[PDB]
C-alpha cells in the first residue's frame, strides 16, 4: 500500500527498503521457489519410505490438494514447524 502511495507521488521520486524490510523483501521474492523445492523434497521423503504409493503414501498423495486448499498469514518459524508437524505425524 505504501508502494502504491509512492507511485502516486510526483515523478522523479523513488523508494527502497532497508534494514529488516529489505531482509523480508529478499526472503519473500524467493520464498515460493525454495518452498516448492522443499515441498518436492518432503514429497520424496514421504514417497520413498513405504515403497512408492504403497498403502499410506498414496493418501499422502492427496496431501497436496489439502496444501493448495490451505489474508491471514504465518511467520517464518511456523512455515518449518508445519513441515515438522507433518513429519512427526508421519513418524507416529
Amino acid at each position: 500500500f505504501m508502494a502504491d502511495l509512492v507511485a502516486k507521488l510526483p515523478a522523479g521520486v523513488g523508494y527502497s527498503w532497508t534494514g529488516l524490510s529489505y531482509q523480508e523483501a529478499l526472503s519473500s521474492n524467493q520464498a515460493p521457489a525454495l518452498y516448492a523445492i522443499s515441498l518436492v523434497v518432503v514429497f520424496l521423503a514421504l514417497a520413498a519410505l513405504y515403497e512408492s504409493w504403497s498403502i499410506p503414501f498414496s493418501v499422502m498423495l492427496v496431501v497436496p490438494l489439502g496444501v493448495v486448499g490451505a489474508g491471514l498469514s504465518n511467520d517464518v518459524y511456523f512455515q518449518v514447524g508445519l513441515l515438522t508437524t507433518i513429519g512427526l505425524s508421519a513418524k507416529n
Partner: protein
C-alpha cells in the same frame, strides 16, 4: 549389502532421481566455460598524468 537394497527396490530409484536433480542443477547453475580457466589472475594498475 545388496539384500538391503534388493528387498527395498524403489528407494535406490529415488536416490537415482535425486542424483539427476543434483546433476541437472549443477550443470545448469555452474559457470560453464568452453575451456579451463588456465589464465592466471591478473592485477592491473592504472594511472593518468594529463
Amino acid at each position: 549389502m545388496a539384500n538391503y537394497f534388493i528387498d527395498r527396490p524403489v528407494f535406490a530409484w529415488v536416490l537415482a532421481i535425486i542424483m539427476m536433480l543434483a546433476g541437472g542443477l549443477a550443470i545448469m547453475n555452474l559457470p560453464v566455460a568452453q575451456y579451463p580457466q588456465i589464465a592466471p589472475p591478473t592485477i592491473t594498475v592504472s594511472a593518468t598524468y594529463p
